Amino acid sequence: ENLYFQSMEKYENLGLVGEGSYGMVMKCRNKDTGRIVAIKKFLESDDDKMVKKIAMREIKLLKQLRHENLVNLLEVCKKKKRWYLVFEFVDHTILDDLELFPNGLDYQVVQKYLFQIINGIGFCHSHNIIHRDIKPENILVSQSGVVKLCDFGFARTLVATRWYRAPELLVGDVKYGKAVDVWAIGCLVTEMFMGEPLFPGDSDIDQLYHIMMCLGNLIPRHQELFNKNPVFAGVRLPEIKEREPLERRYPKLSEVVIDLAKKCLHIDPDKRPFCAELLHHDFFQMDGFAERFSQELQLKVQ
Ligand SMILES: CC(C)CS(=O)(=O)NCc1cccc(-c2ccc3c(NC(=O)C4CC4)n[nH]c3c2)c1
Ligand SMILES: [Cl-]
């Protein structure tokens, strides 16, 4: 179809990005233009016509996912029978800012970051794409403060921190949906403002304890799935008789912020707001921040 390959000869491999965290993604310099890029091996051999078919479907989708708040595909290169995808390289993550401000970020800074994260995730959701692994490491930040989300999870293409995982993911619900990303965003609301993870569990069951001692008992579906899931070895969930609400843990946080977080962190995934509804929240709409920042975000056009 419409897919033409560039050359790997112009790139110099400077090493793996993020000390190898995101896998075999190579930080590369384009020796023709000086641009720095992120290159991932994509296909081991285009000799297999079936693997080739699947690969071109994915490239077609990656091209449709061009957005100011996503790491974008720049080109595809071919070396021998291998394919490589070239994406943008972004220098910093939101971790760098959290490390500078360990007692919480500035209010407007959180507005700008969350607006962009929700904008980027909402765009993917409109293409029926779920990230499923939002965390500070995957939220890149350009020198200009433009957020670029990276490492989305793609279906039909075929240890890790659990702090941002929704209850449906923890209990093994295969009917999870876009609401898992909204849960992850709600986890980031309090983290950015307070300088500490909301639910820093060290196992799936420990993560569930963190969540429910704050937010209460799970919906019936998730308790039943938990009881059937063999990874929990017949163990049973705790019964919450007096949760500790977010505003009790963080009594200084504004009502508007606690409302935003509570909505994203609804125990029932179906009662969480969509990403678009999140941008209409008072947190973003008060004093016309959304209008102003939306036009301000024309630093995307350099
Ligand atoms: C959005 C769309 C749906 C495509 S995708 O994001 O889902 N797939 C492409 C993909 C897959 C896996 C990893 C990456 C990746 C990771 C990191 C960076 C980066 N900076 C850094 O690591 C700095 C040291 C912190 N610059 N560029 C990157 C790219 C990208
Ligand atoms: Cl609460």
Q: Which position among 133, 151, 173, 181 bears the catalytic label? A: 133
CB 284 within 8 A of CB 111: yes
- Residue 84 has φ and ψ, to the nearest 5°, of -130, 135
Which ligand is located closest to the Cα atom of residue 136?
A: 1
What is the Cα–Cα distance from 42 to 24, expressed in whole angstroms?
Answer: 10
Report which of 214, 131, 201 is spatially closest to residue 162, judged by C-alpha positions: 201
The answer to whether 8-91 and 92-293 have equal CATH topology is no
Classify domain 8-91 by CATH architecture: 2-Layer Sandwich (3.30)
Strand order of the β-sheet with 92-93 is: 92-93, 139-141, 147-149
Torsion of CA 282, 122, 179, 255, to 10 degrees: -10
Q: At what angle do helices 255-264 and 179-194 cross, to 10 degrees?
A: 150
**DSSP of 226-245, one letter per residue?**
HHH-GGGTT--PPPPSS---
Cβ-based burial of 143 (10 A; exposed 0-12, middle 13-18, buried ≥19): exposed
- Residue ranges of the domains in the chain? 8-91, 92-293
CATH class of 92-293: mainly alpha
What's the CA-to-centroid distance between 258 and ligand 2, angstroms? 8
Q: How far is CA 273 from CA 178, 200, 247, 261, 265, in A?
A: 10, 24, 20, 11, 10
Name the structure determination technique: X-ray
Q: Which amino acid is at 150?
A: C
Indicate the SS3 state at residue 21.
coil
Q: Please name the residues in contact with 242: beta carbons below 8 A apart, sequence gap of 6 or more.
A: none
Indicate the SS3 state at residue 157.
coil
Indicate the SS3 state at residue 171.
coil
| Token pair belonging to 300 | 């995307």
| Token pair belonging to 210 | 């963190």
Q: At what angle do helices 107-125 and 179-194 cross, to 10 degrees?
A: 170
Residues with CB under 6 A from ligand 1: 17-18, 22, 25, 38, 40, 62, 65, 70-71, 87-90, 93, 140, 149-152
3-state helix, strand, coil in the chain (%, to 5): 45, 15, 40
What's the CA-to-centroid distance between 57 and ligand 1, angstroms? 20
What's the CA-to-centroid distance between 285 and ligand 1, angstroms? 30
Q: How far is CA 81 from CA 8, 44, 87, 154, 219, in A?
A: 12, 7, 20, 23, 50
Q: Which of 25, 72, 116 to mutate to test the pocket of ligand 1 (most atoms within 8 A of CB)?
A: 25
Does the annotation count 133 as an active-site position? yes
CB 40 within 8 A of CB 85: yes
Resolution of the PDB structure in angstroms: 1.7
Segment (H or E) for 31: none
Q: At what angle do helices 107-125 and 289-296 cross, to 10 degrees?
A: 70
Q: Return the CA Rg of the chain.
A: 21
CB 24 within 8 A of CB 41: yes
Q: How far is CA 137 from CA 68, 97, 103, 141, in A?
A: 18, 11, 19, 10
Is residue 40 a known part of a binding site? yes
Breaks (C-N over 2.5 A) in the chain follow: 158
What is the Cα–Cα distance from 151 to 93, expressed in whole angstroms?
Answer: 13
- Residue 9 has φ and ψ, to the nearest 5°, of -70, -25
What's the CA-to-centroid distance between 150 and ligand 1, angstroms? 4
Which ligand is located closest to the Cα atom of residue 140?
A: 1
Q: Which of 26, 150, 181 to mutate to test the pocket of ligand 1 (most atoms within 8 A of CB)?
A: 150
What is the Cα–Cα distance from 58 to 68, expressed in whole angstroms?
Answer: 20
